[PDB]
């Protein structure tokens with residue numbers, strides 16, 4: 001029973017390394033200690049950034065969109081390495097990804113955040129929190145909720161081996177609307193839940209009920225997403241490019 | 246074996262169940278017993294249409310409104326009851342006054358909708374201490390915006406009731422709901438988290454022992470917290486609209502203080 005669960009843990013972790021270029025391990029190294037990133041702290045510093053790495057605030061947002069679409073391909077490859085996933089009804093796989101990705105993006109985005117800013121482009125840059133907060137409405141509020149969540153989320157001190165399994169748990173959520181066959185999704189999630197429990201007990205013996213606390217964060221994650229999606233539609237204020245993004 | 250520290254957790258379990266039973270009149274057990282015909286004396290008058298609604302009133306303005314005004318005052322009671330239960334949670338009354346208020350402000354609706362689920366099945370919901378049963382479709386027939394305020398509540402109830410929890414499982418879970426450390430504006434978060442740590446341990450155990458054959462009930466239950474939170478967010482939305490269309494509808498000042506800047 002409990003050796004199957006380390007396999008699953010190990011399998012997911014290795015797949016997490018293959019699929020994601022910038023790991024929490026690597027992200028944490030850059031936010032702390034020889035090859036620092038370029039800091040974007042104000043209007044002028046963002047200018048030289050493009051030189052290095054319509055208007056300012058729109059050009060940032062679009063940057064998040066290119067990024068996001070890349071992420072979605074990374075998350076999709078990962079998912080397909082989660083056992084059982086690819087033997088599910090295809091409409092469900094697409095449903096699971098369609099509804100899961102925002103939740104995964106802001107989870108892993110936390111890896112790239114401290115209470116002062118977020119690392120960008122493979123950790124070549126850092127965009128400060130108070131700068132993003134200065135951007136003209138409605139963009140100034142776009143990232144603060146994410147920052148508020150990353151503070152809370154990062155306090156759990158999870159590492160990549162923990163996060164890998166968590167992500168799979170998010171993917172395999174059997175409450176997504178319009179799913180045709182929920183049984184095996186729940187069956188896989190149960191198994192992922194067991195693996196996560198054990199992982200967190202063996203990797204963080206001293207953190208009591210870390211499993212519980214981590215799952216509780218799901219509640220804040222989904223608010224984050226609903227809120228952000230609202231913002232997006234409100235934000236409707238190149239043809240073939242629109243289509244991509 | 247069960248060990249000394251799990252002994253303490255089982256004790257916490259008992260205390261809480263007992264307080265739950267003392268602070269809440271209609272338990273899930275009474276609810277089920279009414280809804281599933283264990284009954285020649287406990288059967289409810291069913292409301293499902295306008296005349297039956299009229300016939301029910303032995304046991305004024307207009308209907309959709311009169312129903313919501315009823316929900317208002319019953320929720321006010323519930324807040325009292327939950328406040329009573331909260332006091333009994335070891336540690337809660339010792340916290341900073343302001344946090345006490347904060348935790349009830351955000352806990353209360355999530356607990357109401359957890360317990361409303363015990364009084365529901367797919368076809369309707371018990372009302373008035375379980376003497377009446379108001380059908381789901383009758384509620385849906387209510388005029389906009391009111392035919393929309395309870396569906397989301399049913400969708401959750403049928404999902405939630407599928408976990409098959411009992412009052413002794415619910416007592417610990419509602420404690421966990423109240424003592425949550427990521428509520429906005431709390432002064433001191435560590436104390437609250439240490440209490441929840443204990444509550445979560447107790448729950449984890451109670452579920453294992455009470456439901457030994459169900460895999461990961463603990464987790465599955467914690468996941469339902471996201472559903473509650475979305476029910477509460479959507480509810481508050483809908484209040485906003487009611488206030489604007491019905492300029493003559495009174496809201497209770499207690500409930501208004503809870504909704505204020507959620």
Ligand SMILES: CCCCOc1ccc(C[C@H](CC)C(=O)O)cc1CNC(=O)c1ccc([C@]23C[C@H]4C[C@H](C[C@H](C4)C2)C3)cc1
Nearest residue numbers: 302311312313315316317319320323357360361371372373
């Ligand atoms: C164990 C805790 C039970 C808590 O019950 C409820 C709590 C809250 C709500 C929604 C409220 C809306 C303001 C809220 O979420 O704040 C809705 C409910 C459920 N409603 C009722 O229990 C209820 C419904 C109708 C009535 C009647 C009784 C009688 C006179 C009048 C008209 C008609 C005949 C229905 C009210 C009384 C209670």
